[PDB]
């Protein structure tokens, strides 16, 4: 769903992340690789080590796709159109992997924005990340 207020909170915690969005995105990715080592399977052409440029630059990409989702939130399906294809067709990502990343994303927002990371924004963000994930696994559906 995402309500007028989810969309407001998500409009806003993102507001507040600004320019670091890619730095966070690179951190969320590191966390996941670290916490859920099974995810590492998708990335065998990456150096998955701390200061890795490839993950750095990947963070940037995830982060950008997330921002394209915030801005077009009321139309993520057409907007994440091609990442849906890429992740579910071409990469065959296990949908459980969307839950682990999404979680490292919230742990990374939280770890960064504690003023902003209210129980209710935590909720809006979760729900949002769920919608993004549902979209990028919807050609399995």
């Amino acid at each position: 769903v995402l309500s007028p207020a989810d969309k407001t909170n998500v409009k806003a915690a993102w507001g507040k992340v600004g320019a670091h969005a890619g730095e966070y995105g690179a951190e969320a990715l590191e966390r996941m690789f670290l916490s859920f080592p099974t995810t590492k399977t998708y990335f065998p052409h990456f150096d998955l080590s701390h200061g890795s440029a490839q993950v750095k630059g990947h963070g940037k990409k995830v982060a950008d796709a997330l921002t394209n989702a915030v801005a077009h939130v009321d139309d993520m399906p057409n907007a994440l159109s091609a990442l849906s294809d890429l992740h579910a067709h071409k990469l065959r990502v296990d949908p459980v992997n969307f839950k682990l990343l999404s979680h490292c994303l919230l742990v990374t927002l939280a770890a960064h924005l504690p003023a902003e990371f209210t129980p209710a924004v935590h909720a809006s963000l979760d729900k949002f990340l769920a919608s993004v994930s549902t979209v990028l696994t919807s050609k399995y559906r």
Binding site: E27, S35, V107, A110, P119, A120, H122, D126
Partner: protein
């Protein structure tokens, strides 16, 4: 668990810092707010119809310390996560019938709560250590469903 020395070093050293009166309740609360179905289980607890009402509910903070209690018990009893939790498993399994996935959810919200509380001190390796632990714990409670 395994927990390597360094992971051990990292779990133990954060937990010492943790405000156990107020962290358990920030995580039970976050659960009820983030995952509303779970409030099925605390109708006995009062107004939860708004998250503000969840986060200053005294039964909610009352209960959440009980819950960090059990974690403190498990976190430094990792050798039989299973022994430690049997009674609790029995209570939630064949007594409140809580599907084991909410055990991962709490686990993860707990990891969220710690990250919010420690910020940068909650590095990815420490998070990685904690994930295993919250896992072990979700798996220990859900063991009487078998």
């Amino acid at each position: 668990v395994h927990l390597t020395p360094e992971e051990k070093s990292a779990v133990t050293a954060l937990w010492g810092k943790v405000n156990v009166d107020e962290v358990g309740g920030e995580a039970l609360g976050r659960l009820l707010v983030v995952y509303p179905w779970t409030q099925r289980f605390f109708e006995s607890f009062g107004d939860l119809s708004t998250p503000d009402a969840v986060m200053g509910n005294p039964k909610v903070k009352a209960h959440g310390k009980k819950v960090l209690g059990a974690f403190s018990d498990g976190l430094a009893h990792l050798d039989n996560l299973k022994g430690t939790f049997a009674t609790l498993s029995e209570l939630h399994c064949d007594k409140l019938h809580v599907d084991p996935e909410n055990f991962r959810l709490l686990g993860n919200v707990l990891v969220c709560v710690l990250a919010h509380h420690f910020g940068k001190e909650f590095t990815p390796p420490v998070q990685a250590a904690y994930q295993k632990v919250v896992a072990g714990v979700a798996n220990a409670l859900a063991h009487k469903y078998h």
